[PDB]
Amino acid sequence: PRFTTGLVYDTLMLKHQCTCGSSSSHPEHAGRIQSIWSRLQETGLRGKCECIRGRKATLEELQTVHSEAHTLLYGTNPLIWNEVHSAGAARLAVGCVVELVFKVATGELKNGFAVVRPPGHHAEESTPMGFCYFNSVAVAAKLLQQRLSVSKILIVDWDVHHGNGTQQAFYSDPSVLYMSLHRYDDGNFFPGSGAPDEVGTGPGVGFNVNMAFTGGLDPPMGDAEYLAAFRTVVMPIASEFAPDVVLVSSGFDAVEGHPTPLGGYNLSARCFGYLTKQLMGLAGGRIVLALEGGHDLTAICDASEACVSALLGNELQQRPNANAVRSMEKVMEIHSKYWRCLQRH
Numbered sequence: 001p002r003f004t005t006g007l008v009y010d011t012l013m014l015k016h017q018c019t020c021g022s023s024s025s026h027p028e029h030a031g032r033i034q035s036i037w038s039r040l041q042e043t044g045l046r047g048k049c050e051c052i053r054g055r056k057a058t059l060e061e062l063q064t065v066h067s068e069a070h071t072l073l074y075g076t077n078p079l080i081w082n083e084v085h086s087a088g089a090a091r092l093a094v095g096c097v098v099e100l101v102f103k104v105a106t107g108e109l110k111n112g113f114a115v116v117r118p119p120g121h122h123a124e125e126s127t128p129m130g131f132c133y134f135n136s137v138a139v140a141a142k143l144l145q146q147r148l149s150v151s152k153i154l155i156v157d158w159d160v161h162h163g164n165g166t167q168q169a170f171y172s173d174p175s176v177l178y179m180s181l182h183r184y185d186d187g188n189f190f191p192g193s194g195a196p197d198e199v200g201t202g203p204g205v206g207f208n209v210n211m212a213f214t215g216g217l218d219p220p221m222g223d224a225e226y227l228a229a230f231r232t233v234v235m236p237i238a239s240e241f242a243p244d245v246v247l248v249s250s251g252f253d254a255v256e257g258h259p260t261p262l263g264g265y266n267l268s269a270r271c272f273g274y275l276t277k278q279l280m281g282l283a284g285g286r287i288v289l290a291l292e293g294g295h296d297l298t299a300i301c302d303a304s305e306a307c308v309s310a311l312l313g314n315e316l317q318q319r320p321n322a323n324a325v326r327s328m329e330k331v332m333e334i335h336s337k338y339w340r341c342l343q344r345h
């Protein structure tokens with residue numbers, strides 16, 4: 001298989017759909033991945049990528065993160081939740097991510113983008129929430145640990161909501177660095193978790209980084225604020241950690257056009273191209289992006305285009321607001337205790 005960008009998609013993930021078939025009444029809908037896929041087709045980006053076949057995760061693979069009971073309950077269906085197809089679709093999302101992750105980790109592909117639903121980052125050990133059932137990215141990381149002896153994994157979560165599930169999965173593990181940029185507003189946004197002072201536990205202390213933006217939408221966060229977060233917090237810590245593989249929980253709901261509580265921020269789709277490019281400089285370019293949140297179809301299609309374009313190696317000022325500066329300072333202050341690059345902050 002050609003050493004280029006990988007894509008994974010599967011039409012059976014469209015069948016995690018309520019029988020009413022409405023986008024309106026359920027914002028995590030089939031049209032999210034359908035629209036991204038055709039956008040990558042239309043722009044000729046699919047033709048420059050290796051499109052790999054996906055599969056269902058085994059119950060055993062799901063049990064690297066979730067309890068047996070949870071994997072039986074949402075991973076099998078004897079006689080939104082589609083009573084026929086959701087169990088299969090949720091398993092497909094995990095297995096598609098896993099397949100792409102391994103091809104990149106082994107050197108078979110350069111990098112990749114997983115066009116998957118339902119999303120994963122809110123799913124805890126025994127609890128689904130936020131339209132997530134199994135944590136696809138966490139399962140893929142665990143499998144890298146158990147089947148490829150990957151010593152250091154960076155998980156970057158740039159979905160605008162905190163990935164409570166992923167934080168839980170690796171909270172005591174120093175070999176996985178979980179790094180979330182999210183709207184936090186002192187605990188008063190969705191889900192409500194992800195404080196800057198949650199740094200990990202036991203051997204994992206210092207290896208959970210919550211880049212929690214606080215101060216609400218006054219003014220709302222934008223390109224300059226995320227670029228500054230990347231320059232002052234994300235990349236210094238990510239570089240010092242020196243990961244062997246990068247996984248990105250890539251929600252696009254920070255993009256302009258997501259009203260609160262689905263978003264509230266003013267990132268441009270282009271900015272995600274620039275963030276992707278910055279993460280590609282780590283881990284010998286071994287990076288996989290998996291779709292998490294993001295609702296508005298033009299926003300997520302634009303941001304996907306810019307990420308996949310950046311992954312292929314193509315190409316395409318302002319001070320950060322006082323709320324953002326205060327937020328970054330709170331994080332740097334906490335993490336000065338654990339990271340040499342922030343010792344003097």
Ligand SMILES: Cc1ncc(-c2ccc([C@H](C(=O)NO)c3ccccc3F)cc2)cn1
Binds near residue numbers: 027119251253292
């Ligand atoms: C009161 C209240 N406020 C917010 C939510 C909520 C927001 C986002 C997601 C989710 C997400 O983005 N998680 O990061 C999502 C949405 C749409 C499409 C896809 C999604 F993943 C799930 C739940 C629930 N309840």
Ligand code: NA
Binds near residue numbers: 172175200204
């Ligand atoms: Na960790």
Ligand SMILES: [Zn+2]
Binds near residue numbers: 018
């Ligand atoms: Zn319905």
Ligand SMILES: [Zn+2]
Binds near residue numbers: 253294
């Ligand atoms: Zn989200």
